[PDB]
Specification:
This is part of a larger assembly, with chains A, B and C. Chain A is an alpha+beta fold. Chain A is built from 3 helices and 2 strands; from the N terminus they run αββαα. Chain A has a two-stranded antiparallel ribbon. Chain B is elongated. The chains are: A alpha+beta, B mainly alpha, C mainly alpha. The complex binds zinc ion. It is classed as transcription/dna/rna.
Chain lengths: 50, 49, 65
């Protein structure tokens, strides 16, 4: 698999932190999901993870 | 009445949610108010949950 | 369910040192150094605070409210 395609694919679902790639917050927490421990909406979880 | 939109921590959402022993109020009987000055009759640690 | 006020063996007041202990868990302190800083020399209070499970919030999650 070409490196450019993998890079373009990972740029849409991940962010660069200290040279490494961390998955985006909205990917782990969909809009209809909630915190399994507190039940807060997924938007707050995404803001906290960001 | 005034809290954040999320307020995940119970401290911001609710008030008096943890009943500490400091809420105990000594009620004088008869002349105990005159014999005992204010602040003497009270819980020892004042922080027991 | 909830942290007991008195220690079973000795009887030292331990209910008031629970939430602060949780603060020491919210901080970078480990278990042993936090129990030492709280003033628990004998191991009975250390067992009381360490082996205690906080089930009151799990029950309040099922409370009527
Ligand atoms: Zn003890």
């Amino acid at each position: 698999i070409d490196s450019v395609a993998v890079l373009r694919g990972i740029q849409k679902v991940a962010m660069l932190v200290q040279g490494n790639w961390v998955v985006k917050s909205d990917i782990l927490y969909p809009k209809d999901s909630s915190s399994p421990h507190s039940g807060v909406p997924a938007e707050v979880l995404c803001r906290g993870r960001d | 009445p005034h809290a954040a939109k999320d307020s995940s921590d119970p401290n911001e959402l609710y008030v008096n949610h943890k009943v500490y022993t400091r809420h105990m109020t000594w009620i004088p009987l008869g002349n105990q108010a005159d014999l005992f000055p204010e602040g003497t009759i009270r819980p020892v640690h004042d922080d027991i949950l | 369910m909830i942290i007991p006020v008195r220690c079973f063996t000795c009887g030292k007041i331990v209910g008031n040192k629970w939430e602060a202990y949780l603060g020491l868990l919210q901080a970078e302190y480990t278990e042993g150094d936090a129990l030492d800083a709280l003033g628990l020399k004998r191991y009975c209070c250390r067992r009381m605070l360490l082996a205690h499970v906080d089930l009151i919030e799990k029950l309040l999650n099922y409370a009527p409210l």
